[PDB]
Design a protein around this ligand. Structure first.
Ligand SMILES: O=c1[nH]c2sc(Cc3ccccc3)cc2c(=O)n1O
Ligand SMILES: [Mn+2]
Ligand SMILES: [Mn+2]
Lengths: 555, 425
């Protein structure tokens, strides 16, 4: 049998030749199963016996899927993948079901078997060759090569998808009102035809595909809501993701963890708070598939919290382009934010939770801004437009923040929603020095060998202090000095520093820090009624600065 | 499609470099619709061809509307390809910049990028121009295309077209020898000292020269040639460093001054602060008024005079990057400096009351970037690299909503607040 589909030219990465992982012998029954598999693949043209001038070989395992006595062939194409050209990988993310619009009639067809129905570039086929080992180690091995896209080869997703797009193009042109969405194994077909006509178009589509050698099995044709497409349950007016069950194992294989990471990657597109860092670290190295890894305690905290999030089903509604998109955000504390995207109240398209980006010093307004940006980009991906925002920050608070913040910053059209806890500014510095407020000149100094230092102030009233410090640095003493001045001043205070670092931290307007010292300074700033912070260059003869510099010099 | 009648120029990437592999960013629905429409017609005209995923290269695409335009224009972000493309001096098709342009009383910028599509692109180079129109919600694979003709926004296109542009403009330049014309990327800059009415008439004469050459290579060809954006560079001003004039100085005022003069002494070596700092002896309240001594008033006067003179040792080097820094000053005001070596500023400036003033910082910063880039093209002939006072994620969420130019400069993000702000304040 020959395929009418034209092959895609494929190349090895520049400079590289065929595979160099040779062929394993295995037990009597295992090979006994393989010849039956490969003979029946050769019957449908998927593989072909090759001649005596092919020098390539690719390894193979044998594993079971749900354990009957019928072995499933397992090929580790990681070796061929690293020598195969890149393909521009067109879809990074997966469709989200709330991006779908309502269709009178919907059908989901399965083409997951189609990989083996797409021919592979002939000049590349020789690099997929393998050997069935001798059964008694006497006769030469039967050598076959792949004629079709193999499962697990890096090019198969790209080439299959490209082939489907080209086969589907004429059909979509003939039927501009039908929507066909493609994502690997499943094909979504939606129309607003009455159900009888829609059924007819489906049969036309299926005959079209078969003409090109692509079959859609009769079982996996879903005509009842819920249609399952890409793990989503599509009902007529809502969609559901059923709780995702993760494996439970005493010891984990690399194939196990790889399959696990892929499942968690898909789930993170639907569920929030899914983490994959620590599990992926276990995949480092040239480790083969059947090979046992130990779980770090990081990896099991990651896994355990994932299973708790995934306990719950997720439901939502479909997109109505005739209506606004609305996004509402709430502060949940400890760096956490929740959000809902909807068009009519309480009918959610998507809900999620944003975590603070890590860093030494932050504030709630910046985090709110980050959450807005993240939701915006998500909404562009899913629906192609920016939602209108409902935010727990007063318009006056936001106005004070953005206009006075030294960086450019902005939020798109939004309205205040009175959902406590409201985001607020916890302190605001004066723009001008305070008449009648004591002026504290601060400085610090530390020995870079011993870590011994001093922090202190002098004031226009003759108030002075210097505190010796152990286990410190020059920048830390500068912050200690400011803290001392805040502690020992009245509710209104002018403070003069020469530390661009310390000024810059306070210029960044934090309301929480990883540094306990910055936090104590924040606490002080909150208690004050007015604080003016000025900067002067060190060692330029400025009176009070020079006096405190001498106070904190080592003795 | 057909092999073009015109013979192509061989082009290569820089030695040792591969082509671009840059992810497409997500696009709004209106821009995807515009791109699908534009690319469908360009494909029918043979300017681009569909490709598959076996082409491993990619460059981002989006679409913009020029100022006061309602028509979408395709904008491919070839910044990475442009960095990886050979220089065209050695192949002997660089484009030199005229120092007289900035002196003209009027300069009109024309979009001539459509002309480039009349010249074919070297077949072996086409794969490096791959781009992908994405789909809403990842519902369909992106539509992948590559160029068969000189693309807009690629630095190779004006280089390879220049011999044609020279023939096209030859009769107009002969008849108007005092008009200065400079080509930069997709734009033609046309400067004259004529009266504005007569200037505009000359620009229309030039436009007709270009459309009359449109008869000989039909791909319709006046989509954006119609637009005339007008500049007046002889009236461009610089924002010098100024010191306050006050009848009463407080301790805080004098501290601010010494800090500014100390910083400025890195640019102007003759600056002194000794007599001013002498006023600051003791440990004083910030709001106490300090009367200036004769010696301090003379030091301040001397300093004001130094700051009125240009910086020493500053010369433009076209082999070096131009850098532009921008500070947000508040109340819709934005300062900027252009330099190649720190403290050797080629220009300093200040903008106010731009689109988005008092409501949208990102729009205002985008406009400043565009104005600074236009000035740089006019003055020195190339675009600066920007240091932007904004977080990456904020800028990258929004800048394409406000971009109105057919070039795109390079940029980096500044996250530590500079004292330079109060100094240019
Ligand atoms: O005593 C101090 N000396 C200095 S030098 C400096 C930066 C610098 C480094 C090298 C040359 C000139 C200038 C900061 C401080 C400071 O904060 N204190 O307290
Ligand atoms: Mn100091
Ligand atoms: Mn000091």
């Amino acid at each position: 049998p020959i395929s009418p589909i034209e092959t895609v030219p494929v190349k090895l990465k520049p400079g590289m030749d065929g595979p160099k992982v040779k062929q394993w012998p295995l037990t009597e029954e295992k090979i006994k199963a393989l010849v039956e598999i490969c003979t029946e693949m050769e019957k449908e043209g998927k593989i072909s016996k090759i001649g005596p001038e092919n020098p390539y070989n690719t390894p193979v395992f044998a594993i079971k899927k749900k354990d009957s006595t019928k072995w499933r062939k397992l090929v580790d194409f990681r070796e061929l993948n690293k020598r195969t050209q890149d393909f521009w990988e067109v879809q990074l993310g997966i469709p989200h079901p709330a991006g779908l619009k309502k269709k009178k009639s919907v059908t989901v067809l399965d083409v997951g078997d189609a990989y083996f129905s797409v021919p592979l570039d002939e000049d590349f086929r020789k690099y997929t060759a393998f050997t069935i080992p001798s059964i008694n180690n006497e006769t030469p091995g039967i050598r076959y090569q792949y004629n079709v896209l193999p499962q697990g080869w890096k090019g198969s997703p790209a080439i299959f998808q490209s082939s489907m797009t080209k086969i589907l193009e004429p059909f979509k042109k003939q039927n501009p009102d039908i929507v066909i969405y493609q994502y690997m194994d499943d094909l979504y077909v939606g129309s607003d035809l009455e159900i009888g006509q829609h059924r007819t178009k489906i049969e036309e589509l299926r005959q079209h595909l078969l003409r090109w050698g692509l079959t859609t099995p009769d079982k996996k044709h879903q005509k009842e809501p819920p249609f399952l497409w890409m793990g989503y349950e599509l009902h007529p007016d809502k969609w559901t993701v059923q709780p995702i069950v993760l494996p439970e194992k005493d010891s984990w294989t690399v194939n196990d963890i790889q399959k696990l990471v892929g499942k968690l990657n898909w789930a993170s597109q639907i569920y929030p708070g899914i983490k994959v860092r620590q599990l992926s670290k276990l995949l480092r190295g040239t480790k083969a598939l059947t090979e046992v890894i130990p779980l770090t305690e990081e990896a099991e905290l990651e896994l355990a919290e994932n299973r708790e999030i995934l306990k719950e089903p997720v439901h939502g509604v479909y997109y109505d382009p005739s209506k606004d998109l609305i996004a509402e955000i709430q502060k949940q504390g400890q760096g956490q934010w929740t959000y809902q995207i909807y068009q009519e109240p309480f009918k959610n398209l998507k809900t999620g939770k944003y975590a603070r980006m890590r860093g030494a010093h932050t504030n709630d307004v910046k985090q709110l801004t980050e959450a807005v940006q993240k939701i915006t980009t998500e909404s562009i991906v899913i629906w192609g437009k920016t939602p209108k925002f409902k935010l727990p920050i007063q318009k006056e608070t936001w106005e004070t923040w953005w206009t006075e913040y030294w960086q450019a910053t902005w939020i798109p059209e939004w309205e205040f929603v009175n959902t406590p806890p409201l985001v607020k500014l916890w302190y605001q510095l004066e723009k001008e020095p305070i008449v009648g407020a004591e002026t504290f000149y601060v400085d610090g100094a530390a020995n870079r060998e011993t870590k011994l230092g001093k922090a202190g102030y002098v004031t226009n009233k003759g108030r002075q202090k210097v505190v010796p410090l152990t286990n410190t640095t020059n920048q830390k003493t500068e912050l200690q000095a400011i803290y001392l001045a805040l502690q020992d001043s009245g509710l209104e205070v002018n403070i003069v520093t020469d530390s661009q670092y310390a000024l810059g931290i306070i210029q960044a307007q934090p309301d929480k820090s990883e540094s306990e010292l910055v936090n104590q300074i924040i606490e002080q700033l909150i208690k004050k009624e007015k604080v003016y912070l000025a900067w002067v260059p060190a060692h330029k003869g400025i009176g009070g600065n020079e006096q405190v510099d001498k106070l904190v010099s080592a003795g | 499609g057909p092999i073009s009648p015109i013979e192509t120029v061989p082009v290569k990437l820089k030695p040792g470099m591969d082509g671009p592999k840059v992810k497409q960013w997500p696009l709004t629905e209106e821009k995807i619709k515009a791109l699908v429409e534009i690319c469908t017609e360009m494909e029918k005209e043979g300017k681009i061809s569909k490709i598959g995923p076996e082409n491993p290269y990619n460059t981002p695409v989006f679409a913009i509307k020029k100022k006061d335009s309602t028509k979408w224009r395709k904008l491919v972000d070839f910044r990475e390809l442009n960095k990886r493309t050979q220089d065209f001096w050695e192949v002997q098709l660089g484009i030199p910049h005229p120092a007289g342009l900035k002196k003209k009383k009027s300069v009109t910028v024309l979009d001539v990028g459509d002309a480039y599509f009349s010249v074919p692109l070297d077949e072996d180079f086409r794969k490096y121009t791959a781009f992908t129109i994405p789909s809403i919600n990842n519902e369909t694979p992106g539509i992948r295309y590559q160029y068969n003709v000189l693309p807009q926004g690629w630095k190779g296109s004006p280089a390879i077209f220049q011999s044609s542009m020279t023939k096209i403009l030859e009769p107009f330049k002969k008849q108007n020898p005092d008009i200065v014309i400079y080509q930069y990327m997709d734009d033609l800059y046309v400067g004259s000292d004529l009266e504005i009415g007569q200037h505009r008439t000359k620009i229309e004469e030039l436009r007709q020269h270009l459309l009359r050459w449109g008869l000989t290579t039909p791909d319709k060809e006046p989509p954006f040639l119609w637009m005339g954006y007008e500049l007046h560079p002889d009236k461009w001003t610089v924002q010098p460093i100024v010191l306050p004039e006050k009848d009463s100085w407080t301790v805080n005022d004098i501290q601010k001054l010494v800090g500014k003069l100390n910083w400025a002494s890195q640019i102007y070596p003759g600056i002194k602060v000794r007599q001013l700092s002498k006023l600051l002896r003791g440990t004083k309240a910030l709001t106490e008024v300090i009367p200036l001594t004769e010696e301090a008033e003379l030091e301040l006067a001397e300093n004001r005079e130094i700051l009125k003179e240009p910086v020493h040792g500053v010369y433009y080097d076209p082999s070096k990057d131009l850098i532009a820094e921008i500070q947000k000053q508040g109340q819709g005001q934005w300062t900027y400096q252009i330099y190649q070596e720190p403290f050797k500023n080629l220009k300093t400036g200040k903008y106010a009351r731009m689109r988005g003033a008092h409501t949208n910082d990102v729009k205002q910063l985008t406009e400043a970037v565009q104005k600074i880039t236009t000035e740089s093209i006019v003055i020195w002939g190339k675009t600066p690299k920007f240091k932007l006072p904004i977080q990456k994620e904020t800028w990258e969420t929004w800048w394409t909503e406000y971009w109105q130019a057919t070039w795109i400069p390079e940029w980096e993000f500044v996250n530590t607040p500079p004292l330079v702000k109060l100094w240019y304040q």
